Amino acid sequence: MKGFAMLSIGKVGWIEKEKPAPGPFDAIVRPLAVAPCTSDIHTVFEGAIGERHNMILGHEAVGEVVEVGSEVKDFKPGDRVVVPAATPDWRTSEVQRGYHQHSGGMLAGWKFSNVKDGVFGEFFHVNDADMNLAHLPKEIPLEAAVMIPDMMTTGFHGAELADIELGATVAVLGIGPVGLMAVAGAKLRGAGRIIAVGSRPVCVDAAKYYGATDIVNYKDGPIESQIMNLTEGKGVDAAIIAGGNADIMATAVKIVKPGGTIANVNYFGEGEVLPVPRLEWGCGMAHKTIKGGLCPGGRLRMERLIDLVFYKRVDPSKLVTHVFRGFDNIEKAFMLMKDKPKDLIKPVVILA
Amino acid sequence: MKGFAMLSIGKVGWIEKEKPAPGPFDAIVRPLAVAPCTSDIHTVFEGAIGERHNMILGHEAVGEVVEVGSEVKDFKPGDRVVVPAATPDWRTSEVQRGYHQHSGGMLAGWKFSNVKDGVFGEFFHVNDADMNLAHLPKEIPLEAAVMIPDMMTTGFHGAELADIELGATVAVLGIGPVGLMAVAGAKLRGAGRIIAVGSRPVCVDAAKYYGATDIVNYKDGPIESQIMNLTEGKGVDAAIIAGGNADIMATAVKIVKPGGTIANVNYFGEGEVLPVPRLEWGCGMAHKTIKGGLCPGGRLRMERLIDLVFYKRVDPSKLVTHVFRGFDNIEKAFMLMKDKPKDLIKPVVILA
Amino acid sequence: MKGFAMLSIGKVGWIEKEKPAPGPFDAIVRPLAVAPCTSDIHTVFEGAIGERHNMILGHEAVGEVVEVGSEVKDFKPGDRVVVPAATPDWRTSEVQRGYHQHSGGMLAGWKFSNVKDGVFGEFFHVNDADMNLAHLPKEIPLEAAVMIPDMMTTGFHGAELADIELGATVAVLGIGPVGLMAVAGAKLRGAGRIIAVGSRPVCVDAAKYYGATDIVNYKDGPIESQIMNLTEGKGVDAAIIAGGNADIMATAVKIVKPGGTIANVNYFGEGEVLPVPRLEWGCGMAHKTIKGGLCPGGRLRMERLIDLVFYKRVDPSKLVTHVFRGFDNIEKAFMLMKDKPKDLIKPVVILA
Amino acid sequence: GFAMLSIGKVGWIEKEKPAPGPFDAIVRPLAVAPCTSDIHTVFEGAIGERHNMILGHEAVGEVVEVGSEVKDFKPGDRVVVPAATPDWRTSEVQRGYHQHSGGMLAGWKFSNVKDGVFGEFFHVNDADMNLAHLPKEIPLEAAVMIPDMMTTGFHGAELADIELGATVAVLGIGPVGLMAVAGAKLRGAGRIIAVGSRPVCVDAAKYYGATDIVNYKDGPIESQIMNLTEGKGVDAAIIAGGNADIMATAVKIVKPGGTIANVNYFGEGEVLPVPRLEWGCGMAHKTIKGGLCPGGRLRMERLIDLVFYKRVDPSKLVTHVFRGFDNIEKAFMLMKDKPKDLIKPVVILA
Numbered sequence A, B, C: 001m002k003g004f005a006m007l008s009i010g011k012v013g014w015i016e017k018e019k020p021a022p023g024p025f026d027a028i029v030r031p032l033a034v035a036p037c038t039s040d041i042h043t044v045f046e047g048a049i050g051e052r053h054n055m056i057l058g059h060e061a062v063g064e065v066v067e068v069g070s071e072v073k074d075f076k077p078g079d080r081v082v083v084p085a086a087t088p089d090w091r092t093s094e095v096q097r098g099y100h101q102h103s104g105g106m107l108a109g110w111k112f113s114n115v116k117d118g119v120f121g122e123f124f125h126v127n128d129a130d131m132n133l134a135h136l137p138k139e140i141p142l143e144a145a146v147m148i149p150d151m152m153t154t155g156f157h158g159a160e161l162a163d164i165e166l167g168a169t170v171a172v173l174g175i176g177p178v179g180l181m182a183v184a185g186a187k188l189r190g191a192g193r194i195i196a197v198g199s200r201p202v203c204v205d206a207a208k209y210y211g212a213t214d215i216v217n218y219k220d221g222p223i224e225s226q227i228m229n230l231t232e233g234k235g236v237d238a239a240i241i242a243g244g245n246a247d248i249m250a251t252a253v254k255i256v257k258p259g260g261t262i263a264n265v266n267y268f269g270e271g272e273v274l275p276v277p278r279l280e281w282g283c284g285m286a287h288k289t290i291k292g293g294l295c296p297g298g299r300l301r302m303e304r305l306i307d308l309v310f311y312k313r314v315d316p317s318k319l320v321t322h323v324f325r326g327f328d329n330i331e332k333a334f335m336l337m338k339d340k341p342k343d344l345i346k347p348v349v350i351l352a
Numbered sequence D: 001g002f003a004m005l006s007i008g009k010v011g012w013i014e015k016e017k018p019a020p021g022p023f024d025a026i027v028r029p030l031a032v033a034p035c036t037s038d039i040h041t042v043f044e045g046a047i048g049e050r051h052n053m054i055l056g057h058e059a060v061g062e063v064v065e066v067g068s069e070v071k072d073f074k075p076g077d078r079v080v081v082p083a084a085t086p087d088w089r090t091s092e093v094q095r096g097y098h099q100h101s102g103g104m105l106a107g108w109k110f111s112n113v114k115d116g117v118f119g120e121f122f123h124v125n126d127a128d129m130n131l132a133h134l135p136k137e138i139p140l141e142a143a144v145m146i147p148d149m150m151t152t153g154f155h156g157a158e159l160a161d162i163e164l165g166a167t168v169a170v171l172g173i174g175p176v177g178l179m180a181v182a183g184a185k186l187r188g189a190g191r192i193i194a195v196g197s198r199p200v201c202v203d204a205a206k207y208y209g210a211t212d213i214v215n216y217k218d219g220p221i222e223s224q225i226m227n228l229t230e231g232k233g234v235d236a237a238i239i240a241g242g243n244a245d246i247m248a249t250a251v252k253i254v255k256p257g258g259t260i261a262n263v264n265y266f267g268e269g270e271v272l273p274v275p276r277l278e279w280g281c282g283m284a285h286k287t288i289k290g291g292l293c294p295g296g297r298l299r300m301e302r303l304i305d306l307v308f309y310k311r312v313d314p315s316k317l318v319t320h321v322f323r324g325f326d327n328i329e330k331a332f333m334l335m336k337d338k339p340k341d342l343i344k345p346v347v348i349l350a
């Protein structure tokens, strides 16, 4: 089997791997639709996770099960499934603590394109199929379903961490695909006013579609000053960080009111320290909670997000601005995430 | 002044009262729109809370401030306000515990038509105006605004108590006005599948409008078997009780899965005991949490729900099936709530 | 292999079974100390879980690993271990929801003396050793360690469910071994006043040792009136049910103040319905939360309770009023559990 | 009244007895205690410039006069006065954050926006909401630890979200940290690792439940704790002292999914550092909380029950007891010089 892989830092290319074999609890999946992510770019060209050699990229996929182990019971060859980006080992002490995202170590729940070959191949390996796969209903299109493995679960997690009360005012810092799902997530938690911060017009339109009531362009002035004018000095009840540099952490604390919550799902890939402003954090005593979490994975997380799409609570197809067909177009879609045109949100490659 | 009052258990009529006088922190409001509730029916004709004498009924009103105390700071005569059904004293020990609904004793946060003259009069008294009143934006119609004081905050409270996770399956037992707002609340908490139980078609249509994906009519068979068939034996993650007799508590426990939650906002006016089925409650060990709460009130609760209506997260005007004009039609609206025609959800009397 | 077994409903005795074989993830353990439970009595003489034939009884044991499967990684033959009473399958959807006690179905986390042979034999089988075993420190005596598998985790779970705030007043209804650990748990959650309800003097003395500040004997009058007099009408912030018939549920609701919590760990083995008093539950609106849960199990739960004993946070050896030596005295300890002398709390059998 | 004359200058002034509102009460102090906050206010300008402001915010006094609407307190009652006496009729109270009632940290009024307790009398706003009766069985030197030290340290333990048997590290074993050590024990902590150096504080930490002592004499705190937990880290870290860098140490020693609970007051620097890598680059589920201590009547009543029913003995914090109004100055000066055998000084006035 072939696979679009990271040869080394700054280099990508196709490689031939021996098709993987499933353990007694594992499954082999061929992809029906894949999507590249900004994480793949940070991994290859910035060394976000360190040095990697000959590692197939990609972690957002929808596929068909072709082979299962002798102990796999809920999945058989021919089943269309949604594969979460996080496929942890479910038999660790961190799972018994309630944090499967860190099963076996910090962020160790994320295996694809990290500690194992990713989904950008003719086949890929899923560990613990009965715990890390969810059946895909036929009524959900592939381009919509491939938004569930990473974009939907991450953005919604930012809304979960934000501890949104009914009618609260929420700010979403960054309206990329994750941020757009955070806006939709904030709406799904009963937020009243949703202030979205971003500039790209294609993102602003998608943000309004998902529930944003105000748009703050960080080109029209400082984010902090704009939001304080919108909220008439009250600030926001919660801020969801879905993009930006390390400085955006300071912006979030400044706009959240005392007792509120700063929920980060953004990946800070550079800098030794994330700044927390001393005065705006009450010198340590303002009850401004700061959370930061990896997206949940596993079967149950996927099944619940599938129900949200199935019952028309959120339509993630607005994230898909580019659709390609064919295994070869994985490279072009990946290079699109590196160039990042102003009309791109998320590209999807459809496979035979 | 005039006011539709409870003469005794089973008797209602107009009575003559002394126009109320405000304390230094209080406000006098004349009603602009009022709505009767089922609670008044349980109070008068079932003796659910005991004997009352010449107590003006009603607790759902949008009004105009006509007089304020010397220490009221945020409200002046002429301000259109939304008056929460629950107007507690905010300087008690129960408020410091986080349960203002029971400020001064069980259910003591609910004063109108309970321990104080209600809103069905030419004027009524609001205690602690700066803490128990919210300004009404011009953009919200009166017939919609009067759904906020009680119907919206109660139904949404059922959804809050239910501890709904994103994509969870929620059953709403009873789709009267409170149940319909519980359906809307469940959607606002990110519920996927929402199973609504009721029979009246006007309620069924409203349930579908507010987010119900399935309708269970308790005329077509036992509720438990229908819901267990719908969920393929899994049960529901949460059940919100918004109507029915004491037996509906047993129905809720039977359909909620182990680890789920039964959230009751229904007001049981008859029976000595609410039944909890032993076996289906795991003989005490199934982790099926049972909650039951009076609706939140106060200025902040009203302001947050106003933002939900203002930013078009929920449209409560669909609850209003009958609109009348005039003090005389308060009697007609109250009696409609006693007979409950098959086409009634919520009546509103406009006093423009 | 010898084993004390439930022959049928109402009959027990020693039988010879084929020594069990471990699966690749399992372990074979020989017991060093065991304890009978009230649950074993309900199973044999009341048919609580139905008819059983030649099922070895017992679920509280501390032992030595004698054999492990090829995939067990943290335990080798010779390791002294604490075996939790609940040894669930850790690869189910209920584990992903956070309720391992119901892994595979209601209460299905409890396997010993239910769906598999218990610990009252020369050897027993532990499923998923790396997830369901904890190492036993040498400094902890066997008679103390064998209180961890069930009594400590159940009683402490009652304290966890009660949502105890620092300085709150907690009542524990029933001071058997589980109730005594609920008293200790309430102290470990920062309870101020702890009112323990019981009659047997050996139980009263243990309750005082574990932190009880007041003793209510239900022979001196109704529990409700006694507790309301002690708290001067305030009631308690939480009530932990650790014993009694179904009527104790109504008693619990009557003494808890509005906004409090009723946390049940008791096993109700009789009655079709557990009564919840309508009026004292606020007619459904008193914010009196009712919880009821099976005890937590698994490796992490045992390791944490082991640390509580190791670092001298709780001494469970005071629960042990009878210690016998010898494999044969399992019969005497089990029968002692049925006769219930006034000086008995928990008996322990030491082996070899 | 012992007052802050200006930045760096203090002295006795004119006892202009305060007047109570209809809901307020005038209390004369029976026992007071100075805090590091009093020192930061005067000599570092922590809250800005003040003129003729009576200092002090930890006092157990007796109410001598009440307003016409005070119902639960009469002249002659011995009460515990919390350091935080917020206005209870604001929107932040309806959100559940009375410490910020009317603005960030606005729940703390004594020695901030009103004269403190180091005077012949002081003014307590909303007596029925900000006062608690003091049982006779509780000694004064023990009771005066409740208004600030006990409620702060216990708040650090509350914010930490401690599960039964969890491993908790307390960074800093001053009076607040010592109460955080006792608080973690009250929340069911198993192993409690205390970080500090002064011997009188180390002995108190073991008394309140600390199972390990990490001294910066044997190496960096991060390396020591990782060896103690054999690389597992701790489930929660309560920050009760140190510079801004202690925030980075806290993140490094807490395991993924744990909690950093800060009650420390950071008075210098523009930014508190959160280490990127050890915070999972933003995704390690290491929650960071930081809150002002709770106040009000209920908070005091709950902590009084803990002392009354002998759940915690705060008298071990009191290393020096003085008698007389004049020794308020000497006790205040101890907090500035900080002897190595001092934890908390108390001035008895009854």
Ligand SMILES: NC(=O)c1ccc[n+]([C@@H]2O[C@H](COP(=O)([O-])OP(=O)(O)OC[C@H]3O[C@@H](n4cnc5c(N)ncnc54)[C@H](OP(=O)(O)O)[C@@H]3O)[C@@H](O)[C@H]2O)c1
Residues within 6 Å of the ligand: A038, A039, A150, A151, A154, A173, A174, A175, A176, A177, A178, A179, A197, A198, A199, A200, A203, A218, A242, A243, A244, A245, A248, A265, A266, A267, A268, A293, A294, A295, D283
């Ligand atoms: N926690 C998890 O499990 C998880 C999962 C997936 C991804 N992530 C990470 O979360 C982040 C989300 O990125 P993405 O997938 O949504 O694609 P993206 O296009 O890179 O998102 C960046 C968004 O933030 C905007 N932005 C840049 N700087 C900003 C600033 N100072 N303030 C406000 N907005 C700013 C960008 O607008 P402009 O075009 O003007 O720059 C854009 O709208 C990534 O870093 C990703 O690696 C985390």
Ligand SMILES: NC(=O)c1ccc[n+]([C@@H]2O[C@H](COP(=O)([O-])OP(=O)(O)OC[C@H]3O[C@@H](n4cnc5c(N)ncnc54)[C@H](OP(=O)(O)O)[C@@H]3O)[C@@H](O)[C@H]2O)c1
Residues within 6 Å of the ligand: B037, B038, B039, B042, B150, B151, B154, B173, B174, B175, B176, B177, B178, B179, B197, B198, B199, B200, B203, B218, B242, B243, B244, B245, B248, B265, B266, B267, B268, B293, B294, B295, C285
């Ligand atoms: N917690 C609070 O603060 C608060 C506030 C306001 C009201 N309440 C109370 O909550 C309840 C809500 O009533 P409402 O105002 O929404 O008007 P409602 O029309 O009386 O609500 C009754 C609903 O329950 C249904 N019902 C009756 N018996 C049923 C059964 N065996 N099984 C299933 N459904 C059954 C009814 O079915 P049909 O469609 O056939 O009629 C209807 O859908 C009332 O008791 C009210 O007093 C509480």
Ligand SMILES: NC(=O)c1ccc[n+]([C@@H]2O[C@H](COP(=O)([O-])OP(=O)(O)OC[C@H]3O[C@@H](n4cnc5c(N)ncnc54)[C@H](OP(=O)(O)O)[C@@H]3O)[C@@H](O)[C@H]2O)c1
Residues within 6 Å of the ligand: B285, C037, C038, C039, C150, C154, C173, C174, C175, C176, C177, C178, C179, C180, C197, C198, C199, C200, C203, C218, C242, C243, C244, C245, C248, C265, C266, C267, C268, C293, C294, C295
């Ligand atoms: N949730 C779980 O996972 C779990 C685990 C283990 C056990 N359990 C069950 O929880 C219960 C705990 O029993 P145990 O192991 O602690 O032994 P136990 O000695 O049988 O406990 C009975 C206690 O409850 C008292 N009691 C009986 N009726 C009472 C009444 N009307 N009012 C007040 N107290 C009353 C008893 O009073 P006296 O002092 O007069 O006897 C005694 O103190 C058992 O039913 C057990 O099967 C549950």
Ligand SMILES: NC(=O)c1ccc[n+]([C@@H]2O[C@H](COP(=O)([O-])OP(=O)(O)OC[C@H]3O[C@@H](n4cnc5c(N)ncnc54)[C@H](OP(=O)(O)O)[C@@H]3O)[C@@H](O)[C@H]2O)c1
Residues within 6 Å of the ligand: A285, D035, D036, D037, D148, D152, D171, D172, D173, D174, D175, D176, D177, D178, D195, D196, D197, D198, D201, D240, D241, D242, D243, D246, D263, D264, D265, D266, D291, D292, D293
């Ligand atoms: N959130 C609130 O409401 C509240 C209330 C009261 C006070 N506070 C503030 O919280 C802090 C608690 O201070 P305190 O009253 O308990 O007296 P303190 O003596 O100042 O407590 C400081 C503790 O931290 C130690 N320390 C200093 N640098 C350290 C470092 N790099 N690493 C580890 N430990 C270090 C100190 O050692 P030494 O023994 O050598 O000094 C001492 O043990 C103060 O800053 C206070 O202003 C907050």
Ligand SMILES: C[C@H]1CCC[C@H](O)C1
Residues within 6 Å of the ligand: A037, A039, A059, A085, A086, A107, A110, A150, A294, A295, D283
């Ligand atoms: C950190 C990593 C988690 C899973 C997939 C995301 O894109 C990035």
Ligand SMILES: C[C@H]1CCC[C@H](O)C1
Residues within 6 Å of the ligand: C037, C039, C059, C085, C086, C110, C150, C267, C294, C295
């Ligand atoms: C009631 C029973 C359930 C599991 C734990 C022990 O076996 C007791």
Ligand SMILES: C[C@H]1CCC[C@H](O)C1
Residues within 6 Å of the ligand: D035, D037, D057, D083, D084, D108, D148, D265, D292, D293
């Ligand atoms: C900031 C200030 C709050 C109340 C009293 C404490 O000592 C410190």
Ligand SMILES: [Cl-]
Residues within 6 Å of the ligand: A025, A091, A128
């Ligand atoms: Cl496995």
Ligand SMILES: [Cl-]
Residues within 6 Å of the ligand: D023, D089, D126
């Ligand atoms: Cl006031």
Ligand SMILES: [K+]
Residues within 6 Å of the ligand: A259, A260, A261, A287, A288, A289
């Ligand atoms: K907060």
Ligand SMILES: [K+]
Residues within 6 Å of the ligand: A137, A307, A310
């Ligand atoms: K489905």
Ligand SMILES: [K+]
Residues within 6 Å of the ligand: B259, B260, B261, B287, B288, B289
């Ligand atoms: K539950």
Ligand SMILES: [K+]
Residues within 6 Å of the ligand: B137, B307, B310
């Ligand atoms: K508005």
Ligand SMILES: [K+]
Residues within 6 Å of the ligand: C259, C260, C261, C287, C288, C289
């Ligand atoms: K409650």
Ligand SMILES: [K+]
Residues within 6 Å of the ligand: C137, C307, C310
């Ligand atoms: K140990």
Ligand SMILES: [K+]
Residues within 6 Å of the ligand: D257, D258, D259, D285, D286, D287
């Ligand atoms: K956390």
